[PDB]
Amino acid sequence: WLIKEELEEMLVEKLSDLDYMQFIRLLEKLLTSQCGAAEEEFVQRFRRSVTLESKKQLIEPVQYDEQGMAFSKSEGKRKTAKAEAIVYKHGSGRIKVNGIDYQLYFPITQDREQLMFPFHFVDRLGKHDVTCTVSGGGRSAQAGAIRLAMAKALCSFVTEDEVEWMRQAGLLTTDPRVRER
Amino acid sequence: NQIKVQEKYVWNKRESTEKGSPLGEVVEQGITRVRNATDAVGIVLKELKRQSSLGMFHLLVAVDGINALWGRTTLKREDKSPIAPEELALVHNLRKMMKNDWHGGAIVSALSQTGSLFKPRKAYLPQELLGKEGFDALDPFIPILVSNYNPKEFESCIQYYLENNWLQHEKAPTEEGKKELLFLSNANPSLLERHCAYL
Numbered sequence: 001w002l003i004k005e006e007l008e009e010m011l012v013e014k015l016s017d018l019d020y021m022q023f024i025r026l027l028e029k030l031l032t033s034q035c036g037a038a039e040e041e042f043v044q045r046f047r048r049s050v051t052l053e054s055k056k057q058l059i060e061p062v063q064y065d066e067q068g069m070a071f072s073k074s075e076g077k078r079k080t081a082k083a084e085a086i087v088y089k090h091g092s093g094r095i096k097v098n099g100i101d102y103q104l105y106f107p108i109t110q111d112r113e114q115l116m117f118p119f120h121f122v123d124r125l126g127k128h129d130v131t132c133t134v135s136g137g138g139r140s141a142q143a144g145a146i147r148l149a150m151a152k153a154l155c156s157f158v159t160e161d162e163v164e165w166m167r168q169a170g171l172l173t174t175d176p177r178v179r180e181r
Numbered sequence: 182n183q184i185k186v187q188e189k190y191v192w193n194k195r196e197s198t199e200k201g202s203p204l205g206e207v208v209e210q211g212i213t214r215v216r217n218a219t220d221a222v223g224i225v226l227k228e229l230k231r232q233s234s235l236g237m238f239h240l241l242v243a244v245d246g247i248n249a250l251w252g253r254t255t256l257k258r259e260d261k262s263p264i265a266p267e268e269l270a271l272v273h274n275l276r277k278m279m280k281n282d283w284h285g286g287a288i289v290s291a292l293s294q295t296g297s298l299f300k301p302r303k304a305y306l307p308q309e310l311l312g313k314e315g316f317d318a319l320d321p322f323i324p325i326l327v328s329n330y331n332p333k334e335f336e337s338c339i340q341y342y343l344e345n346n347w348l349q350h351e352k353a354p355t356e357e358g359k360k361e362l363l364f365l366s367n368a369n370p371s372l373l374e375r376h377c378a379y380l
């Protein structure tokens with residue numbers, strides 16, 4: 001709804017709280033009735049836009065390799081670890097970390113669960129191939145960076161609703177917590 | 182009792198094994214007096230490599246973690262100096278069995294980085310684990326690759342564990358749990374067994 005101060009600006013007249021409330025009540029009553037054309041553009045005169053839609057994750061464009069296979073590349077960062085992942089549209093669930101199989105690059109089960117989290121959240125385990133390169137940081141930081149990179153690359157092959165579900169699950173947000181001086 | 186020695190072996194001035202005695206006696210002398218245990222092992226090998234050539238019996242030499250023989254040891258002298266594998270009689274006599282200078286049997290071996298000395302965790306190929314000396318010793322040889330479970334083997338192993346009621350989590354018998362186990366183990370038998378152990 002149009003806030004009091006900008007209503008004053010539109011009217012070029014100072015007005016109180018109670019008369020603003022009365023005007024808003026009348027506008028709501030007009031909305032409740034079967035408003036026709038002139039009515040709802042009249043109301044739209046007094047309704048601003050909430051341009052804070054945070055569903056603005058940038059879907060990476062789909063690229064094609066020389067073999068004609070579709071894929072998407074993305075980046076991620078966790079502490080000092082930085083990862084870049086390529087997710088293929090079709091695959092058998094093979095993840096290659098620095099040219100090494102993920103169960104060999106990540107002996108600890110926690111990191112493997114972190115690498116699971118993105119694909120499992122959207123029910124496509126075993127349906128994609130991942131080729132990622134990670135550098136810097138430690139075991140957990142590298143695992144988190146790779147998770148973020150794979151989620152951001154996997155956003156391309158899922159629906160917008162699934163992208164939003166991943167966003168609400170925290171799979172597409174960079175973790176800003178780092179060591180403090 | 183069927184296998185018999187062809188030489189007089191002298192354990193000490195008082196005790197000796199005469200020619201024609203059963204091999205078990207030698208084994209007993211190694212089991213009763215540990216002082217002559219290592220000497221008793223080599224004799225056995227010396228006999229088994231020889232008699233098998235005559236055709237008395239078929240011999241199998243199954244050495245697991247064979248890469249230890251031509252590597253390094255973590256055993257020290259009293260002067261804190263390193264000891265080479267060839268300076269051990271037990272290791273020295275077992276190398277003679279790996280050479281293909283005898284017939285009437287087969288030599289089967291398996292590599293292992295688990296428990297290996299001075300090897301990185303991800304080294305599994307023959308040359309990397311054996312070393313130049315080990316490869317030269319075993320060469321020529323037939324390598325056989327052992328890989329992770331294929332989908333059929335993975336499904337059958339999980340069905341075996343389920344038939345033994347070894348997966349107690351309610352989501353394990355379902356399909357989503359099977360996908361999660363497959364991903365977490367990547368079909369590796371050992372990782373799958375360890376994960377299923379505590380579920």
Ligand SMILES: Nc1nc2c(ncn2[C@@H]2O[C@H](COP(=O)(O)OP(=O)(O)O)[C@@H](O)[C@H]2O)c(=O)[nH]1
Nearest residue numbers: 189190191192217219220221223224227270274
């Ligand atoms: N106590 C004892 N051990 C023996 C005797 N003969 C052979 N051995 C052991 O059995 C093993 C047989 O290996 P061998 O053919 O003799 O090779 P070599 O050590 O270089 O001479 C030897 O390494 C000895 O340790 C013996 O007459 N008395």
